[PDB]
Amino acid sequence: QIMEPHDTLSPAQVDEYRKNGFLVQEHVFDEEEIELLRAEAAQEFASGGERVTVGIVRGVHGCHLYSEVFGRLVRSPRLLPIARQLLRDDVYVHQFKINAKRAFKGEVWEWHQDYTFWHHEDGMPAPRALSAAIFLDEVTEFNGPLTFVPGGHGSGMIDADVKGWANTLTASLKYSLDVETMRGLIERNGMVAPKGPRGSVLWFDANIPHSSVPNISPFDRGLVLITYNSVENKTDVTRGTRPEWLAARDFTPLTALQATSF
Ligand SMILES: O=C(O)[C@H]1NCC[C@@H]1O
């Protein structure tokens, strides 16, 4: 329901986003909305098939192509307008995934830049993309928050070690940054793990270096990540290596959900 004005970031929020390369908006969705997304996530974890990642499952990819709920979510007036605003274009979804770190579980996700994968694997011409991470649970110091180098997107794509899409979905990553490159960045820029309550959205740049650590809390950390790409910056489908549920190929510009009686 687009029953009120489309959401936009304030000028200060935009500046903060461009300068740091990430930004948290608190309390975007309420508990009932988050519960609908948790239930739909659980159903996709149960029947995603080859799109799932694992012991017990912690990942699924491309759900907005298969789920009515997730298809509407990406068009939400809480999300689509800000993605247009930050990318200064019409947009489409390049990638959709859900990442759960359960209580007392999780892995060390090595430092990486999303754009590096999308440039090399999918043919994304420029880093004119971003991810919206919806917090299905409160993100704290202790349940494995996404961790960033603030301003580290202004490096461009950093020269990365390489180890098809064999290890793109897994915490041992195909493209990871040197112990060496990372020290220089962090001495200069520091590190930040954005936190916020359930229903928050964390916007981050395609090129920001990020990482995370296990969840040593007794609470789950579920994240829905929607990667919006500029339509002008659509991926070169001739250099693409991965299926539609990792890298979308329908570049129709999205429009927002209209308010309807159903
Ligand atoms: O491979 C991908 O496209 C995603 N998984 C880890 C880095 C990206 O977000």
Side-chain angles (χ1 to χ4, degrees), residues 4-55 57-162 164-177 181-262:
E4 49 160 9
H6 283 190
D7 296 12
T8 40
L9 297 182
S10 65
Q13 286 171 304
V14 172
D15 291 353
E16 189 199 322
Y17 172 78
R18 301 217 183 287
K19 170 191 175 237
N20 297 324
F22 65 81
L23 175 84
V24 176
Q25 291 180 277
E26 300 196 343
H27 290 131
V28 167
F29 299 105
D30 69 34
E31 279 284 331
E32 291 63 53
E33 291 169 321
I34 289 301
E35 193 41 53
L36 300 171
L37 301 184
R38 288 166 110 290
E40 185 77 355
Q43 252 197 49
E44 283 266 295
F45 286 152
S47 70
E50 63 191 309
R51 306 190 285 104
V52 176
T53 280
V54 293
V57 316
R58 48 75 99 123
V60 58
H61 285 78
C63 314
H64 70 304
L65 300 172
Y66 308 102
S67 160
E68 224 272 342
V69 170
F70 289 139
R72 288 172 71 73
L73 177 66
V74 305
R75 301 162 72 205
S76 181
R78 319 273 82 81
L79 297 178
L80 179 64
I82 285 156
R84 298 169 167 181
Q85 177 188 20
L86 289 178
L87 300 182
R88 306 187 79 227
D89 196 0
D90 279 311
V91 302
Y92 78 94
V93 177
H94 173 61
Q95 177 174 94
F96 183 110
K97 60 190 168 288
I98 314 185
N99 285 0
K101 268 180 190 165
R102 269 92 195 215
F104 304 120
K105 278 208 336 191
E107 318 194 58
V108 180
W109 284 67
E110 311 193 309
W111 287 105
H112 58 293
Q113 288 162 302
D114 290 339
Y115 172 61
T116 295
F117 297 72
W118 300 327
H119 180 87
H120 287 302
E121 299 298 304
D122 305 320
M124 184 179 291
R128 193 177 163 185
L130 53 52
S131 296
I134 303 161
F135 291 2
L136 300 183
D137 298 293
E138 197 185 3
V139 176
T140 72
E141 188 176 347
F142 305 109
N143 56 359
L146 257 36
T147 301
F148 299 101
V149 179
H153 58 310
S155 284
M157 135 173 88
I158 289 163
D159 223 54
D161 296 340
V162 192
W165 47 279
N167 34 120
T168 55
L169 319 178
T170 62
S172 188
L173 288 172
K174 181 169 183 174
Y175 304 99
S176 70
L177 298 183
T181 16
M182 285 319 309
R183 148 158 29 258
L185 230 26
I186 290 153
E187 278 182 348
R188 204 149 46 248
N189 292 295
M191 269 171 303
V192 178
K195 330 292 195 273
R198 162 182 280 171
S200 293
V201 180
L202 161 68
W203 298 99
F204 65 95
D205 191 274
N207 226 351
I208 200 184
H210 63 277
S211 168
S212 69
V213 306
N215 177 357
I216 60 145
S217 88
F219 312 123
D220 295 341
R221 188 225 63 173
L223 291 180
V224 181
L225 295 104
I226 310 163
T227 297
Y228 292 101
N229 191 25
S230 149
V231 163
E232 174 166 49
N233 188 45
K234 59 196 184 177
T235 57
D236 175 357
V237 97
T238 84
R239 299 191 306 234
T241 67
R242 307 200 294 184
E244 245 228 303
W245 49 267
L246 293 184
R249 284 195 282 281
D250 179 2
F251 306 132
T252 307
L254 292 179
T255 65
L257 293 172
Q258 298 160 234
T260 67
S261 300
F262 51 84

